Amino acid sequence: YKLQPLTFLLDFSVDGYIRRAIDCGFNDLSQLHCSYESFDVESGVYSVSSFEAKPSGSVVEQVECDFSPLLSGTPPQVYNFKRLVFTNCNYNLTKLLSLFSVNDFTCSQISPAAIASNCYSSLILDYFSYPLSMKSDLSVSSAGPISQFNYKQSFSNPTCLILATVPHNLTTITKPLKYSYINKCSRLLSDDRTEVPQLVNANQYSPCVSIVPSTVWEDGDYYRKQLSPLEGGGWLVASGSTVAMTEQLQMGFGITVQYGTDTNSVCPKIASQLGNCVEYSLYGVSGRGVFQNCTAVGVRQQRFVYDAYQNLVGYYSDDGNYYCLRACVSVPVSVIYDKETKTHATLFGSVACEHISSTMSQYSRSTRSMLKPVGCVLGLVNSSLFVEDCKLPLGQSLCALPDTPSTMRLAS
Amino acid sequence: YKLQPLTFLLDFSVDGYIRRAIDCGFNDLSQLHCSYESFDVESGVYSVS
Amino acid sequence: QTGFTTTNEAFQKVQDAVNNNAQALSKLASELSNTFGAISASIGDIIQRLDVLEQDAQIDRLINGRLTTLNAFVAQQLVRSESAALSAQLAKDKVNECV
Amino acid sequence: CNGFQKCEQLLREYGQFCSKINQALHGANLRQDDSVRNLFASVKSSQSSPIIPGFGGDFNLTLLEPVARSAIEDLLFDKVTIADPGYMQGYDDCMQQICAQYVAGYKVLPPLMDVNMEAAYTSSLLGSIAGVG
Amino acid sequence: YVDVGPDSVKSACIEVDIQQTFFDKTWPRPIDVSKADGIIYPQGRTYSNI
């Protein structure tokens, strides 16, 4: 017998050895037995989880930006880092990792597999020359000098910090004379009594970085530029430290994913148009809805449309076809235990009678894989006698007027 | 005209273009409209600075 | 018979009571389903964030917030039912004597 | 939750909280039914005069049933705007287009009394008023 | 980089007369929110009638 994690109500006799157990998952009555924590529950109308329609006919809606410029030519220093933005273009993560051996791979606030699989609104990649030894000094957020005065990554945006070594075989990358960074950046005030340090923002240009040459002449070299009176006067103090060049060039790369921009798909005929059913997906937003031609409301300047709710409907995404989606249909189930008569009757609330499907044929949701046209009560009920007026009446009140006496045998 | 961050009540036509808007920050009367989130509100005593 | 909405204040009270019950049920449920998590699609980190670890954290906080909001909604329903029971007894007394 | 494997693992731990919420809702619905029955019991057991188009001379009677759904009561139900409860065809009406089952997820229970049954109770009261005067 | 085409070969720039006082006029045009003057539409998506 297969074993699966399950919640089992356990009844213990005087000995304490288990004698009777209830499986909550199998059958609606067993879920009711788990409720109240009693083997037998008093007869009542009890709601059960609604049966959601199965998703079907999924629709999916999803140039070729090369990563060659980043790996070609001399990489700039961390203070002089240059960021390249790639938008609406096919991209391959595998090619970049194969091209450069990756000593350290880390992604913050995001999953590396997830970003590759999911289309991204924007992909900004920053190229910098970074020594391999100080892996700790480079961080998305740190008090270390490289984050504080050289290159930083935005904590709020999901960001990936990658340290890689250029292969000797690759000739496109040109080794810098030596790794260079500015250890300390500060600006003297006009009075000169107080000097205030400046911390570089992520993806933010630095005036001190510009005054320092791309390769610092000496470790702890000092550069002084007198600030203009228009900018408040005083002097600019820059201290740059040099790291000896490694035999193999090492480059620090900062990866930033933007999903903020509404309309952009950086992706790595079921999926196409036709499919007036539950499953669907669009350029950047995926939702389950039924699409019908409506031609009622929408400027159409933006393909996605909002319903004044936190989750936008996103309808009218195709310019050619005006389709307005609807919410997924779920059918509520109400069961009367009728413990005294020991008969269970199942009623599906609303959704007419024909719409409901026997044994969850059209509905994925069920208590378990094994479950459990005459007239049309509040909902179709599996009872042999549709009407038995004045026969042993009991006030079950399953829906409204019907008393449903089973002393099955409903609507009296 | 310089722009500054602010919350503005927005009215959308069937075309969806914004025919009219309300600036809540401009005055107490606009602030009561912003509180109800309705362009037209019945006259009543309202919270003030 | 000719005027109910303006002539009768009591009819306006019926309209207000019907509007209040419908508004409370519709507004509350929709707001809870409307991205309770700071950054979510009603489900936290379903695939985009750090696989299972990030997903479990965001889903857990969203579920806990929904449960507390549901408890507040249930408490409001219990207060409404108690007030209804008192009013129903008053209505029965009016039918017994005044009518 | 919309319904996911991850949601289920957390939900089973919080299952007791979900169960207690359901118990309170079931009790509230039952007590509301008990209140409706108590008011109906007072109306019932009273002899009722057969309804007459004119109960007395020179007396206008909008209360007379058009035939269920007395005129003024219909006026009242019409002026007001109730779209929250749909039964049997309510889900079908939403698909044609409130949306209790479509989004979020709750079920609005039936009143448990037909409008015609409520009108019949008012009809019995109308006959009783003249007799118990 | 980019090319703007050949630079002007003119020997000297044309003389400019500055008359700020003549230009100054009383023409007040306050932003009217009611008429949606100078408000950007939300770029993310179109919105419902309400």
Side-chain angles (χ1 to χ4, degrees), chain A residues 1 3-10 12-27 29 31-38 40-59 61-63 65-81 84-89 91-119 121-123 125 129-146 149-152 154-156 158-165 167-172 174 176-186 188-202 204 207 210-218 220-234 236-245 247 250 252 254-257 260-278 282-305 307-309 311-337 339 341-359 361-412, chain B residues 1-28 30-47 49, chain C residues 2-8 10-11 13-22 24-26 28-65 67-68 70-75 77-79 81-99, chain D residues 1-31 33-34 36-38 40-41 43-62 64-68 70-71 73-74 76-78 80-90 92-94 97-133, chain E residues 3-39 41-44 46-50:
Chain A
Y1 301 105
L3 288 184
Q4 35 270 325
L6 274 170
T7 314
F8 265 39
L9 186 138
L10 300 181
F12 307 96
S13 294
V14 190
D15 56 356
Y17 285 93
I18 174 70
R19 287 294 170 261
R20 281 191 52 183
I22 301 183
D23 179 18
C24 299
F26 184 58
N27 293 352
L29 292 325
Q31 309 257 181
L32 252 315
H33 297 331
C34 299
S35 182
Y36 295 88
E37 288 285 326
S38 58
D40 59 319
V41 288
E42 306 297 325
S43 61
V45 194
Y46 296 116
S47 297
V48 196
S49 179
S50 302
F51 280 27
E52 36 92 11
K54 300 173 179 178
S56 57
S58 320
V59 161
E61 304 295 328
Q62 286 188 4
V63 181
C65 50
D66 63 326
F67 294 151
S68 178
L70 300 151
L71 50 102
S72 297
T74 311
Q77 297 296 341
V78 260
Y79 58 111
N80 309 309
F81 81 101
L84 269 75
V85 182
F86 305 104
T87 49
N88 273 327
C89 63
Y91 77 116
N92 191 16
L93 281 197
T94 79
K95 76 172 183 294
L96 197 53
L97 60 93
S98 70
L99 206 138
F100 287 113
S101 304
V102 175
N103 315 76
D104 177 42
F105 200 102
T106 48
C107 279
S108 176
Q109 224 264 329
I110 215 68
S111 174
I115 46 174
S117 62
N118 302 349
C119 302
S121 298
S122 178
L123 190 61
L125 305 185
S129 311
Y130 197 69
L132 211 61
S133 58
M134 33 172 61
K135 294 186 176 303
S136 59
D137 205 351
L138 192 50
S139 178
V140 177
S141 56
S142 79
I146 301 287
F149 308 100
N150 289 277
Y151 172 68
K152 189 189 174 182
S154 49
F155 198 82
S156 58
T159 38
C160 296
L161 196 81
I162 312 295
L163 194 39
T165 299
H168 301 96
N169 300 352
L170 183 75
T171 181
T172 69
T174 308
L177 180 61
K178 53 186 173 299
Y179 306 107
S180 291
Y181 72 93
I182 168 179
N183 62 83
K184 189 62 191 58
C185 158
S186 200
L188 189 63
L189 262 55
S190 57
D191 63 340
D192 127 283
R193 264 270 67 184
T194 306
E195 186 165 3
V196 174
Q198 280 78 29
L199 191 135
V200 299
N201 202 12
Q204 301 300 180
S210 76
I211 84 179
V212 181
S214 60
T215 308
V216 193
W217 307 323
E218 192 63 34
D221 207 354
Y222 300 114
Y223 304 97
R224 300 296 177 266
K225 302 298 169 304
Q226 203 272 329
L227 301 176
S228 73
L230 193 58
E231 64 184 323
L236 189 53
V237 163
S239 179
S241 176
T242 67
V243 181
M245 187 55 197
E247 52 99 20
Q250 296 136 358
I255 283 77
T256 301
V257 64
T261 82
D262 61 333
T263 176
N264 192 308
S265 58
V266 176
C267 300
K269 61 178 292 296
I270 283 299
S272 127
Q273 219 74 69
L274 280 196
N276 286 357
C277 40
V278 182
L282 311 166
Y283 308 80
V285 44
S286 178
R288 295 191 311 267
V290 272
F291 288 78
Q292 298 93 2
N293 56 328
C294 305
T295 75
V297 169
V299 226
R300 296 306 235 96
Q301 316 306 322
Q302 296 99 358
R303 306 181 308 267
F304 315 125
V305 169
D307 51 353
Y309 282 113
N311 52 326
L312 77 153
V313 264
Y315 66 59
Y316 288 7
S317 284
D318 181 35
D319 199 19
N321 294 342
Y322 285 61
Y323 286 153
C324 79
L325 57 98
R326 265 214 58 91
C328 179
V329 196
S330 301
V331 191
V333 201
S334 63
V335 181
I336 33 179
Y337 188 49
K339 185 217 305 184
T341 84
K342 280 304 295 299
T343 65
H344 72 279
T346 64
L347 180 139
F348 284 74
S350 296
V351 204
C353 286
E354 25 92 10
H355 288 108
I356 92 176
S357 68
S358 178
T359 70
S361 171
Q362 305 158 356
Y363 311 120
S364 174
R365 168 64 203 176
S366 179
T367 66
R368 224 215 57 89
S369 307
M370 305 310 167
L371 280 90
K372 184 188 185 64
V374 38
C376 197
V377 215
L378 194 92
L380 215 61
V381 179
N382 302 345
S383 166
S384 63
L385 306 168
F386 197 71
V387 171
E388 288 293 326
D389 202 11
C390 301
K391 238 66 65 187
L392 298 174
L394 177 64
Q396 285 282 343
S397 300
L398 160 71
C399 29
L401 294 199
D403 275 354
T404 316
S406 299
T407 299
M408 172 145 288
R409 208 184 62 197
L410 57 86
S412 288
Chain B
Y1 310 95
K2 279 300 294 299
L3 309 174
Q4 73 276 344
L6 238 166
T7 307
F8 273 33
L9 237 176
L10 289 188
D11 190 6
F12 301 92
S13 299
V14 175
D15 63 2
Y17 287 124
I18 13 182
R19 293 299 180 269
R20 51 179 301 184
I22 275 185
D23 177 11
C24 325
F26 175 67
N27 67 325
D28 282 329
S30 61
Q31 278 287 342
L32 82 93
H33 291 116
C34 212
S35 175
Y36 286 90
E37 289 101 17
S38 179
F39 270 70
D40 181 359
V41 179
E42 302 300 1
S43 60
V45 174
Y46 299 91
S47 180
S49 294
Chain C
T2 51
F4 287 113
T5 165
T6 58
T7 82
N8 304 340
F11 178 77
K13 172 188 303 186
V14 193
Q15 178 85 59
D16 297 347
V18 165
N19 294 353
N20 290 350
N21 60 66
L25 176 61
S26 61
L28 256 55
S30 62
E31 85 206 6
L32 306 187
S33 63
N34 277 347
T35 76
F36 165 79
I39 170 181
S40 64
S42 92
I43 310 290
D45 314 0
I46 342 173
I47 44 177
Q48 47 273 344
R49 271 140 284 175
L50 206 54
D51 209 8
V52 183
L53 308 172
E54 221 169 343
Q55 178 167 9
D56 289 3
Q58 240 268 9
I59 291 191
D60 195 20
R61 51 171 296 265
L62 199 145
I63 290 303
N64 297 348
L67 285 173
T68 57
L70 244 305
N71 297 338
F73 161 78
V74 156
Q77 289 289 331
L78 295 177
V79 170
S81 67
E82 173 64 32
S83 69
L86 302 172
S87 67
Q89 181 61 40
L90 178 62
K92 176 182 178 181
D93 298 344
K94 293 294 293 297
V95 167
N96 294 349
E97 168 67 27
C98 197
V99 178
Chain D
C1 182
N2 299 357
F4 287 96
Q5 282 78 23
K6 292 294 179 55
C7 255
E8 298 158 6
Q9 309 152 4
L10 288 172
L11 249 12
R12 66 190 294 178
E13 316 296 330
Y14 302 125
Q16 63 273 354
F17 303 116
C18 303
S19 304
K20 69 175 53 66
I21 290 169
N22 292 344
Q23 299 284 350
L25 294 159
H26 187 254
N29 301 345
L30 255 54
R31 80 176 58 104
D33 160 48
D34 299 344
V36 170
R37 274 265 63 96
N38 198 25
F40 277 161
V43 184
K44 202 59 215 312
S45 91
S46 307
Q47 314 173 8
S48 64
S49 175
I51 307 298
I52 314 286
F55 278 102
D58 295 357
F59 293 129
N60 192 12
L61 270 148
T62 67
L64 164 75
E65 303 288 337
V67 172
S70 181
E73 173 143 349
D74 299 7
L76 267 65
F77 277 79
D78 304 354
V80 310
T81 48
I82 346 175
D84 43 295
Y87 306 112
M88 300 183 302
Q89 53 269 347
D92 310 338
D93 187 33
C94 294
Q97 295 161 6
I98 321 183
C99 306
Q101 323 98 1
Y102 280 83
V103 245
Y106 44 95
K107 201 262 179 172
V108 177
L109 270 303
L112 214 100
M113 202 57 57
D114 278 11
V115 183
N116 304 354
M117 281 294 299
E118 300 159 6
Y121 273 102
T122 68
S123 300
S124 175
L125 253 168
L126 188 56
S128 80
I129 299 168
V132 198
Chain E
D3 187 26
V4 291
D7 298 330
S8 176
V9 290
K10 191 58 188 299
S11 58
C13 297
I14 322 303
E15 32 86 27
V16 144
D17 181 28
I18 290 184
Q19 295 295 332
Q20 178 70 77
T21 62
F22 282 78
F23 273 70
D24 291 333
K25 286 296 173 182
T26 51
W27 286 329
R29 278 199 198 263
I31 275 290
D32 196 11
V33 75
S34 303
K35 58 183 59 178
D37 272 356
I39 62 168
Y41 195 79
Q43 263 66 47
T46 97
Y47 274 87
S48 60
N49 185 54
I50 60 180

